[PDB]
Design a protein around this ligand. Structure first.
Ligand SMILES: C[C@]1(C(=O)O)OC[C@@H](OC(=O)NCCNC(=O)O[C@H]2CO[C@@](C)(C(=O)O)OC2)CO1
Ligand SMILES: C[C@]1(C(=O)O)OC[C@@H](OC(=O)NCCNC(=O)O[C@H]2CO[C@@](C)(C(=O)O)OC2)CO1
Ligand SMILES: C[C@]1(C(=O)O)OC[C@@H](OC(=O)NCCNC(=O)O[C@H]2CO[C@@](C)(C(=O)O)OC2)CO1
Ligand SMILES: C[C@]1(C(=O)O)OC[C@@H](OC(=O)NCCNC(=O)O[C@H]2CO[C@@](C)(C(=O)O)OC2)CO1
Ligand SMILES: C[C@]1(C(=O)O)OC[C@@H](OC(=O)NCCNC(=O)O[C@H]2CO[C@@](C)(C(=O)O)OC2)CO1
Ligand SMILES: [Ca+2]
Ligand SMILES: [Ca+2]
Ligand SMILES: [Ca+2]
Ligand SMILES: [Ca+2]
Ligand SMILES: [Ca+2]
Ligand SMILES: [Ca+2]
Ligand SMILES: [Ca+2]
Ligand SMILES: [Ca+2]
Ligand SMILES: [Ca+2]
Ligand SMILES: [Ca+2]
Lengths: 204, 204, 204, 204, 204
């Protein structure tokens, strides 16, 4: 468990191999969540930002960037997509929440809410996941795809087991995130596989 | 009747069934009206914003968004269209008024007056309407069309039986609208059908 | 004659019929003139803004908008065209002057001088005109063309029998035009024909 | 000689005929020069701004505008071209210097230096020129080309027999140029031929 | 040899011959380095900014501009590319660092950090280089290519044998660079070959 404050994971190249495994202490199925992180990439093609798979379930929870200005959330294989005006290339802060009771998914880009969408109302995302950054999973922990690899820098990743109110989203965006009980950048259990470098964050 | 202050209807998905029925004691034929509301959608295709049909009368009163930067009003099946510069996607405040005696239709977009157009001078829009959000009607209450469905968020919807002067339009835009006697967001009678979720308004 | 201060003509629809006739007490041939007015239209196709014909003479004096960013003046069937950066759609203030002795035509868009052009040096534009707003004449008083009709709003129309200096152009733009002897918005002699509505000017 | 302070040459129409001859008593071949002037044109096609020909020598010194954002200097039939971001149409202040010893040509657009280019190092531009505004010469004083004619307004033209330092360039742009010894707007010997009109400068 | 403060190399024309050799007594293979310089060119095609070759080694260290908004670093024949929003044409300040131990390459454009990339981790860039400005080498000191030549102005060139922290990059951008131990603009050992002119820096 490492304090990565002020630091990013650099995925310096395209590969089918470089990734970071994220280990969460959570062992119960997810009804509600919020996921925030910072990314800086100049890929124009599609890539996975956050890949969460469970046994026999691809795309159980997936944050996927299809193209510039477009963000997709997959819950249990089902997908929503929301659009935003953004410059390319540019650093970005991304928060996404999802609520089982309503099905509502909320993207926040640089503290700006995108249009709400809804999917998988009543569903629970399964526990005991494999979580990977830098690659998209098609199996429980593997079956990566070069054309979906993340190339660039990721920092300030937090994941909470609740839907964060606007004020806590903005706080995360501004660099004072509330401590997070699923994944916390300041106490992160992770394994680097292949070519991933930890560097100071210089682009905020 | 519900006070919806600070809240929105979220139509979280494309469908042919998700809609809200708006209930009003409108018994007298309309010679004059103003309709104001806020909307936030990232659809690029055409969609109905506000659909009002009467017995044997399609498109009796319809606010229809043909494409980005173009707003159409239908009165008694007749149509006018006006253009504006806008960003996409972006939250928008829309006011539209119409006046029988001159036939003049006025769109106001984020407090900004569009070019006046005119239609159905001397006409009275029929009473006893079925008013629906989220779908466009082709019958008296039904005959919805998936390709015309509204996906996104609608809030702050008011409707008056008179033509609002510019200062009152601006008041609505700024969030202090005058009391409204046809539809009022702070005392709204409505029916949710299918997948519509009420959420706080976070994008104003 | 009417004081049209704070008011516009609204030509609410495309037609081959709707127009306003303007009556001048001029009688003398024009060697010098300035014409100023405001217009708000979201037409993209070409249209006539100000059509002045005499017996047996088409396009004796015509202000014609070919396309966005381009303004044409016709004097005695001859034309010049000048370009400008403008937003679309957008309210605009237009002044045009012409001086026989030099032939110089000056367009002023929102108090901004366009490139000077020149035509019909030594020519006298004929008196006893039919002057129309909303349609382009191909005869003396008629032969209108739907594809040249003006749809939108026109206000603050003044015409002088002299070439206004930049100061006077700016004054008119900023809302205090010098007293005008050919045509005067504050004492206008006009005939409405077909669908033209007088409304308060709300876009300035 | 005429003091043209506050005045421009207006070339109000395209032609193969309209031009201004500029007269200088220069008998000594040019080793160094700076040329500054103001131009306002809405031509999109190529045009000559300043044409300097000597006997049996085309394009001895030529300032030619190929298209928007690109300025060309010809010295002794050789060419350099430099690019700039500019709006269109827009008034522009242009300075260009050339230095034989280095061959360096410097364009300055609205007081902004363009990328330096180099041509004809060691060369002397020939004396006893015919200098024309409004047309491009292909002979000694004539052989004009309609498609190269300048339509628009030129003012504040000065030419020095030395390379001006940046400070004197900014001075020219700001409207306080140093006295010039080849050509001087405030003591200009010229011949108008065809349709060219002197008018006040209104666009600065 | 030679304080070039306040001065630039001007490469005034396209050629296969015009270049500047930069001489340094570097005998130790580089593990870490930072290179900073100022460039101003209106070339649209690809060109080499900084060409560093060793005996039998092409593209040992090379800064290459593929197209507008795209910067490439070659280390030992391998390359990375990073993208940026930039105006064209425009003066630019470029810093690039590379670090053997991590393989990380950092581009800084006008003091703005680009997305980090990585190449040749564990590699040492060879010493005893031929370093040239204005041309790209394919041999040890020669084999130039006209389609790769730099046309324009270069100044403020510094090279350090370490990775400069962001603060030091900004200092170089602001015009107060730290003394550099490989290449220093204020004490530069150079050889001008062909048409290269030293001029004052006027675009900073
Ligand atoms: C004939 C038919 C069909 O059965 O209808 O199958 C082939 C084809 O349909 C597909 O190929 N469907 C799957 C498309 N793949 C896709 O959308 O992948 C997305 C979601 O999954 C990820 C994120 C992934 O897990 O790698 O990649 C991007 C056309 O329709
Ligand atoms: C041959 C002919 C003709 O008879 O002239 O008929 C077929 C075709 O004409 C039409 O299809 N006309 C109706 C077009 N439909 C239309 O404009 O729908 C609009 C208005 O109504 C709504 C808003 C609607 O109520 O769904 O949808 C978009 C071409 O012309
Ligand atoms: C063969 C020939 C010729 O004789 O050269 O005649 C037919 C054709 O030339 C024309 O048709 N010329 C007249 C074009 N009409 C035109 O420019 O109308 C303009 C000006 O007048 C207005 C403003 C109008 O008054 O309606 O409409 C646009 C090609 O050349
Ligand atoms: C066969 C050959 C050749 O002999 O190499 O000559 C004909 C052709 O090359 C040219 O025609 N070159 C001259 C083209 N004209 C040109 O560049 O005009 C420029 C420069 O001169 C001015 C400024 C002018 O003086 O009119 O107009 C624009 C192809 O190459
Ligand atoms: C057949 C094959 C192959 O063997 O794979 O070689 C020929 C072709 O591949 C190339 O030609 N590759 C090299 C192309 N040149 C290139 O990428 O130049 C870059 C890098 O080198 C510089 C900087 C240079 O040193 O000139 O120019 C730009 C297709 O693939
Ligand atoms: Ca997958
Ligand atoms: Ca995959
Ligand atoms: Ca309908
Ligand atoms: Ca329908
Ligand atoms: Ca006509
Ligand atoms: Ca006509
Ligand atoms: Ca010539
Ligand atoms: Ca020529
Ligand atoms: Ca090479
Ligand atoms: Ca090469």
């Amino acid at each position: 468990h490492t304090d990565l404050s002020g630091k990013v994971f650099v995925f310096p190249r395209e590969s089918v191999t470089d990734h970071v495994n994220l280990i969460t202490p959570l062992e119960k199925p997810l009804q509600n969540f919020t996921l925030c992180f910072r990314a800086y990439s100049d890929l124009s093609r599609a890539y996975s930002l956050f890949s969460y798979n469970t046994q026999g379930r691809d795309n159980e929870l997936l944050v996927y960037k299809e193209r510039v200005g477009e963000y997709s959330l997959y819950i249990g294989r089902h997908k929503v997509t929301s659009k935003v005006i953004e410059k390319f290339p540019a650093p970005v802060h991304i928060c996404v929440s999802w609520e089982s009771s309503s099905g509502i998914a909320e993207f926040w880009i640089n503290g700006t809410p995108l249009v709400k969408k809804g999917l998988r109302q009543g569903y629970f995302v399964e526990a005991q996941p494999k979580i990977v950054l830098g690659q998209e999973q098609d199996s429980y922990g593997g079956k990566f795809d070069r054309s979906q690899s993340f190339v660039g820098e990721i920092g300030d990743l937090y994941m909470w087991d609740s839907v964060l109110p606007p004020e806590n989203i903005l706080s995360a965006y501004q660099g004072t995130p509330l401590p997070a009980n699923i994944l916390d950048w300041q106490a992160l259990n992770y394994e680097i596989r292949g070519y991933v470098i930890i560097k100071p964050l210089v682009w905020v």
